[PDB]
Amino acid sequence: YLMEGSYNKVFLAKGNIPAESYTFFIDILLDTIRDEIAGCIEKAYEKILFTEATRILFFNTPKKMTDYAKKRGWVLGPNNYYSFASQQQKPEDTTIPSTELAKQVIEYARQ
Amino acid sequence: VIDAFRLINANMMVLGHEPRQTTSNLGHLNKPSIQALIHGLNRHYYSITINYRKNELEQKMLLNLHKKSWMEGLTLQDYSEHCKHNESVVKEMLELAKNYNKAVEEEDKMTPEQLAIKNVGKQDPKRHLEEHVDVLMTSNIVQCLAAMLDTVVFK
């Protein structure tokens, strides 16, 4: 289920447990959901509202307004959670990592 | 080709020259050519050898007679004739491919000795190959290499 991009019916599937608790692992499951939703939203995005990042995932607004600053930052403006751009320019140097690639005749074909 | 004769002489018919004690000037050298024996006096002599002790200073001074400017060594020629030269060579490789296909297609059991008595015609399969492709590579790779040997230090 963690390989599918559904990430919320696991907890209702956690609602029925055929063993004693299955919660000690579910805590680590919570942890992993936290940093996966972090690392998935931290790329370029266009400013989801407070409620979607707050209640739709987990934490019925206990501390998520604080957890927001705890994890990443992304300072709040008029009720939006904007992602900064973060697109690499493709620096056109390619001398050090591709000088042997540039030499991909002589230092493999002995002439 | 040099000689420096030592008075090839015929004064007396029972003597040669005064020193005959070593084979360095007598047998070590090459024996003279037949026509020099014919129209020259057959009592031949001399042993020309460079024998100048191999002076290292002038040797190192001369060395390369085809060194260029250092700033010429970084030149790029040009990109336009590079590309049309490549285009020119691709058609000749196509034609060489056609010839190569025919020559592998014949595969006659006539023996390679008799294959080498009928190759005198225009047929040149694989008889070029290298003469362009490395010429291709030495066209490309240096043009590639000099493309990157002037970049990270020039801004």
Curated annotation (Swiss-Prot), chain A:
Component of the 26S proteasome, a multiprotein complex involved in the ATP-dependent degradation of ubiquitinated proteins. This complex plays a key role in the maintenance of protein homeostasis by removing misfolded or damaged proteins, which could impair cellular functions, and by removing proteins whose functions are no longer required. Therefore, the proteasome participates in numerous cellular processes, including cell cycle progression, apoptosis, or DNA damage repair. The lineage of its organism: Eukaryota, Metazoa, Chordata, Craniata, Vertebrata. Component of the 19S proteasome regulatory particle complex. The 26S proteasome consists of a 20S core particle (CP) and two 19S regulatory subunits (RP). The regulatory particle is made of a lid composed of 9 subunits including PSMD8, a base containing 6 ATPases and few additional components. Interacts with DDI2. Interacts with TASOR. It comes from the Eukaryota. This is 26S proteasome non-ATPase regulatory subunit 8. The chain holds residues 235 to 345 of 350 of the full protein. Belongs to the proteasome subunit S14 family. There is a cross-link at residue 63 (Glycyl lysine isopeptide (Lys-Gly) (interchain with G-Cter in SUMO2)).
Curated annotation (Swiss-Prot), chain B:
GO terms for cellular component: cytosol; cytosolic proteasome complex; extracellular region; ficolin-1-rich granule lumen; nucleoplasm; nucleus; proteasome accessory complex; proteasome complex. Widely expressed. Highest levels in heart and skeletal muscle. Keywords: DNA damage, DNA repair, Hydrolase, Metal-binding, Metalloprotease, Phosphoprotein, Protease, Proteasome, Ubl conjugation pathway, Zinc. The modification Phosphoserine is found at residue 69. It comes from the Eukaryota. The keyword DNA damage applies. The modification Phosphothreonine is found at residue 111. One of its GO terms (molecular function) is metallopeptidase activity. One of its GO terms (biological process) is protein deubiquitination. Its EC number is 3.4.19.-. The keyword Ligase does not apply. Coiled coil: none annotated. Component of the 19S proteasome regulatory particle complex. The 26S proteasome consists of a 20S core particle (CP) and two 19S regulatory subunits (RP). The regulatory particle is made of a lid composed of 9 subunits including PSMD4, a base containing 6 ATPases and few additional components. Within the complex, PSMD4 interacts with subunit PSMD7 through their respective MPN domain. Interacts with TXNL1. Component of the 26S proteasome, a multiprotein complex involved in the ATP-dependent degradation of ubiquitinated proteins. This complex plays a key role in the maintenance of protein homeostasis by removing misfolded or damaged proteins, which could impair cellular functions, and by removing proteins whose functions are no longer required. Therefore, the proteasome participates in numerous cellular processes, including cell cycle progression, apoptosis, or DNA damage repair. Belongs to the peptidase M67A family. PSMD14 subfamily. This is 26S proteasome non-ATPase regulatory subunit 14.
